[PDB]
Amino acid sequence: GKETLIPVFLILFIALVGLVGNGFVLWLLGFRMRRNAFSVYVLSLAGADFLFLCFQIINCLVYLSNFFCSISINFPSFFTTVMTCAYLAGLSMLSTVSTERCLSVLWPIWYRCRRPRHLSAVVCVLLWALSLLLSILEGKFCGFLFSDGDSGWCQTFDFITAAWLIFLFMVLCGSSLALLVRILCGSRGLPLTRLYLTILLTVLVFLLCGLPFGIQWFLILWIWKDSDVLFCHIHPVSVVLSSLNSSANPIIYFFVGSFRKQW
C-alpha cells in the first residue's frame, strides 16, 4: 500500500532521468557524432537500457493508475521477458566494454592494426542474440508468454541465467583487474589516479546496482522462499537499484568521456 508507493515515485523520477539521458545518447551516437569501434558498445548499451527504463516507467505508471483510479490495466505477459532481455543485454554490454578496454591495454599493436572493423558489431549482435535466447526460454517455461509452463522446469533454466550472470560479473571483475595490473606495473604517460578511480567506480556500480536486481529476481527469490519478507521489503529496493544503474550508465560511459572537453 503506502510502503510501496514511496519507492515507486523514486522509480518514475530516476527512470525519467535515465530515459532522457539514454535518448540523448542514442540520438547523438546514431546521427550527430562519428562512431569509433568502441562507440557501438555505448550505443548498444543505451539501446538495451532504453527498453528496460521504458518498461519501468510503464510498470510504475500503471501502479499509480491502479492505486488511485483503479482501472485495473491487465498487461500482456510478454513484457517481462523483453524487459529481462533488455536488462541482460545491458549487463553484457558492460562486461564487454570492460573486456575491450583490457584487450586494448594488454595488446595495443593488435588493437590498432589487426583488429577487424566489424568485430564490435558481431560481438554486440551475438550477445544480444544470446540474451534474447536466455530471455524467451525463461519466458516460455515460466508462463510469461502465450502458453504456460511448469515451475519445476522453470527453476532449472532460471538458475542458468543466474550462473550466466555470475560469470558475466566475474568476466568484468577479472578483466578490469588485469588492466589495473598492467597500468600499475609498467605504464608511463597515463593518468593513473583518474584511471583507477573510473575503473573502480564502474566495478562498484556494476556490483552494487546492476547485479542486485538480477540476483534477487532469479537466484535469490527461488532459494530463499520467504515470501512475506522478500516482496514487501526486498523487491522495491532491488528494482530501484537496478533502475538507478541504468540511469547512471550513460553518464559514466558516454557523457563523462565525451563532454569532458566542453567542461
Binding site: T80, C142, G143, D148, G149, D150, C154, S227
Partner: peptide
Amino acid sequence: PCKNFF
C-alpha cells in the same frame, strides 16, 4: 504464472 511477478 509460475513467477511471483513484480
